[PDB]
Design an enzyme around this catalytic site. Structure first.
Site, PDB file in Angstrom:
ATOM      1  N   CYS A  60       3.407  10.402   0.970  1.00 39.46           N
ATOM      2  CA  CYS A  60       4.074  11.650   1.321  1.00 39.46           C
ATOM      3  C   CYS A  60       5.581  11.450   1.422  1.00 39.46           C
ATOM      4  O   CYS A  60       6.371  12.278   0.944  1.00 39.46           O
ATOM      5  CB  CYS A  60       3.504  12.168   2.641  1.00 39.46           C
ATOM      6  SG  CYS A  60       1.721  11.943   2.767  1.00 39.46           S
ATOM      7  N   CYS A 108       2.425   8.964   6.773  1.00 45.58           N
ATOM      8  CA  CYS A 108       1.887   8.577   5.480  1.00 45.58           C
ATOM      9  C   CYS A 108       2.990   7.999   4.605  1.00 45.58           C
ATOM     10  O   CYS A 108       4.167   8.316   4.786  1.00 45.58           O
ATOM     11  CB  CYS A 108       1.245   9.791   4.809  1.00 45.58           C
ATOM     12  SG  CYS A 108       1.506   9.942   3.043  1.00 45.58           S
TER      13      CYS A 108
END
Lengths: 105, 529
Positions: free
Chosen positions: A33, A30
């Site tokens: 993140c 991600c």
RNA sequence: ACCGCAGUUUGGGCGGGCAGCUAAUUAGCUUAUGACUUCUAAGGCUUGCCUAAAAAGUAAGGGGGAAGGCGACAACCCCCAAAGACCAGCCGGAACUAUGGCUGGCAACUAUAGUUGAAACUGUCCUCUUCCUCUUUA
DNA sequence: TAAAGAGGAAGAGGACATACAGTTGA
DNA sequence: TCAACTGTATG
């Protein structure tokens, strides 16, 4: 300094454990993140002695994320002794997370 | 540019056509929004790579400096407490501000999956709990396999028909002009969403069956025909429409203006056509402006063609600007908004507010109470009879809702007209206007002030004074209501609206005066007059 | 007060307009954030009569005929009338009062001379926030 | 008098107000 | 066979 979590030990780790615990649900592939990992690493050190921090990899504890009403990653849950004291979703900025914790502590 | 709003009468067939077109437009809005949200991921990823580069550069520039100050500079952002540093360290603090928000990250090994938005375009995004982002396409037709990279790609009737057939819907009957208009609206909304200088504009919202499009916009051409002798307007997609306005020929002034675009609108009062008009020279200006991308692509910005184009554009714009300038008497005014009077003047003029709108508001409140009681009784009877399905609204309730809507429209129109008149008056009388408002009172008063529309008044006055060649000022509001204007000393008030200066050296000592007049005089003085 | 119609608003214009007092079904003063018809849940005084939320409707330039509506009323037909009030200049620190005065022309009304003919108009989309109504808890 | 839902509106405040090719059809 | 509509390009 942040504590790596697991599915087997979650109940005692995050509920029976004394004090507030900020658990971040993390996945490697991600973008947002990877945007906030440094910020959580910083907060684990700045607020040391005032709030513990923790991480759970949704690819390595898959059953934990669904239970607590978590749908998108990243997600932050400030647990306090058996229940989610505070919840947040989104790659906050440093100031946003700092004000969030200041309000919720 | 100006807009002339003309009332028209539609037949039943025309109204059915209008409803069908508005439904198709709502469908298009939703489709475009879905595509844009799907596509935002690439933009965010590019922004993120740039931001990682910026953090890296700030880190390098911070580390390569001497170790003495860098530790304190880092702690400045790493700790909430912030001491008063010296200029030397403050310069580095500013020069490394990107640390005030983020910290370095690899941004490598990612699979650029579609992202979900929140309240901002960049921060707060999340990826729902593997598949790289891929572009959607038109299923078939003459344009099979075209990637819908931008929203402008959706301006194709053939592809839209392919999508409608894919979803098992009838083909579009709406013309492409209105499709372009809706796409323009969406583009403006999205640009507002992504602009950081705006902090109240957020993601556009889906439209449900209760929030359908209420307007048709043609931003490509003027109406096909405007027959002034026979009172008819021929527009795209409809048979000829009849005009039931008596002063439209005089307001439009078609012998000295230039129609550009139009909109078919629906309001509780009826159906309108809004025609946008501008100066005749405008059509030349645009022809040159649209030509700039060509020469910039063919000769470069440094060529003589570019300079000639810029010079001609400036010349035409100056002619347009001077086409509406009026010589004045050089009169200066200070204006202060008030509570009893909408505006007060530096020479004692107190303008009354639009007292007629308050009565409309009270009427609306009474009608709303009546409608709510009726709905409650109807729902109770529906439940008692033994039904669990949702209720169907009654005819009396529909009539009451129509009345409430018409009252809302009447109030809005009344406020608009009052503000227009007052702004025009002030623009005609005075050349230099100084404006300042003290909203400290806000810290029902909100009910009274929500009906005066002071911001709209100020905006109209500013625009009208600028067009005529005047000057508009917004001086600071520091110590205006409590300062004697002929002395500058802080005085006292002996009433709800009266003021008296304190020191005995004043010429107006012990002489009560209107507080609003004093505020206006102070604002005028603070404007250099 | 309010409601309908005149592009949208204000001052006005035509029409609808509860109740009380006064004078003579029709004129004045106070006054209602519309008026009326049909059928009802409910309520009041005593088996009858009154008032009625909700529901479904009617009309809102003047006059005369008129199929048809339970009713308010009226499709269709004939006559009269026509205000969100005219044009162009020049003054105006243009409020109070939602734009005052002068000059010329043009209309309408009175008795060749008077009165009236007021102002303004740049809208649409979007996202936030506010206001209000009604509910639930306190 | 206070606070939280649901629904109907408006006010703030910023922008915006197309040109040429190519094709159809009465 | 010319006006109106649809596709392309730019911001």
């Amino acid at each position: 300094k942040i504590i790596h979590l697991t599915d087997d030990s979650f109940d005692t780790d995050v509920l029976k454990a004394d004090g507030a615990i900020l658990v971040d649900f993390w996945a490697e592939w991600c973008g947002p993140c990877k945007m906030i990992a440094p910020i959580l690493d910083e907060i684990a050190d700045e607020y040391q002695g005032k709030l513990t921090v923790a991480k759970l990899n949704i690819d390595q504890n898959p059953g934990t994320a669904p239970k607590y009403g978590i749908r998108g990653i990243p997600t932050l849950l400030l647990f306090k002794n058996g229940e989610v004291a505070a919840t947040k979703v989104g790659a906050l900025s440093k100031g946003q997370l700092k004000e969030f914790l200041d309000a919720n502590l | 540019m100006k807009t002339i709003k003309i009332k028209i009468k539609l037949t039943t067939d025309q109204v059915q056509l209008c409803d069908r077109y508005l439904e198709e437009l709502t469908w298009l809005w939703n489709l475009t929004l879905s595509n844009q949200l799907h596509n935002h991921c690439v933009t965010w990823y590019a922004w993120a790579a740039k931001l990682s580069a910026d953090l890296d550069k700030a880190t390098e520039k911070l580390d390569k400096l001497k170790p003495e100050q860098q530790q304190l500079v880092k702690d400045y952002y790493r700790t909430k407490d912030k001491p008063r540093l010296t200029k030397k360290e403050q310069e580095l603090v500013a020069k490394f501000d990107i640390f005030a928000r983020w910290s370095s990250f690899s941004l490598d090994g990612i699979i650029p999956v579609p992202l979900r938005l929140g309240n901002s375009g960049y921060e707060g995004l999340s990826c729902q709990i593997i598949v790289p982002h891929k572009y959607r396409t038109f299923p078939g037709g003459k344009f099979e396999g075209r990637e819908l990279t931008t929203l402008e790609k959706l301006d194709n009737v053939n592809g839209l028909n392919t999508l409608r057939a894919f979803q098992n819907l009838p083909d579009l009957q709406v013309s492409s002009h209105y499709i372009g208009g809706l796409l323009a609206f969406f583009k403006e909304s999205w640009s507002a969403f992504l602009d950081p200088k705006r902090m109240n504009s957020r993601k556009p919202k889906f439209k449900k069956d209760s929030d359908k499009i209420t307007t048709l916009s043609n931003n490509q051409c003027a109406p096909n025909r405007i027959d002034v002798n026979k009172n008819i307007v021929t527009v795209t997609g409809f048979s000829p429409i009849t005009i039931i306005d008596k002063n439209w020929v005089k307001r439009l002034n078609l012998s000295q203006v230039l129609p550009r675009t139009y909109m078919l609108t629906q309001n509780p009062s009826g159906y309108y056509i809004n025609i946008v008009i501008a100066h005749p020279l405008h059509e030349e200006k645009i022809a040159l402006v649209k030509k700039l991308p060509k020469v910039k692509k063919e000769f470069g910005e440094d060529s003589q063609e570019y300079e000639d184009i810029k010079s001609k554009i400036k010349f035409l714009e100056q002619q347009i600007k001077e086409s509406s300038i009026v010589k004045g008497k050089d009169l200066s005014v200070g204006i202060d908004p008030g509570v009893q009077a909408v505006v007060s003047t530096d020479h004692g003029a107190l303008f009354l507010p639009n007292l007629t709108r308050e009565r409309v508001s009270i009427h609306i409140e009474e009608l709303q109470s009546r409608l709510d009681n009726a709905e409650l009784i109807n729902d109770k009877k529906w439940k008692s009879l033994g039904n669990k399905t949702p209720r169907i609204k009654t005819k009396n309730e529909t009539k009451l809702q129509e009345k409430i809507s018409r009252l809302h429209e009447r109030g809005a129109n009344s406020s608009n007209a009052f503000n227009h008149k007052l702004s025009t008056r002030l623009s005609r009388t005075y050349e230099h206007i100084a404006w300042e408002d003290t909203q400290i009172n806000n810290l029902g008063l909100n009910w009274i002030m929500r009906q005066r529309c002071l911001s709209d008044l100020k905006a109209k006055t500013k625009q009208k004074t600028e067009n005529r060649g005047g000057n508009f000022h917004e001086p600071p509001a520091n110590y205006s209501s409590q300062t004697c204007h002929c002395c500058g000393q802080k005085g006292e008030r002996r009433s709800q609206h009266e003021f008296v200066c304190k020191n005995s050296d004043c010429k107006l000592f012990d002489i009560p005066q209107q507080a609003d007049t004093n505020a206006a005089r102070n604002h005028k003085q603070n404007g250099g007059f």
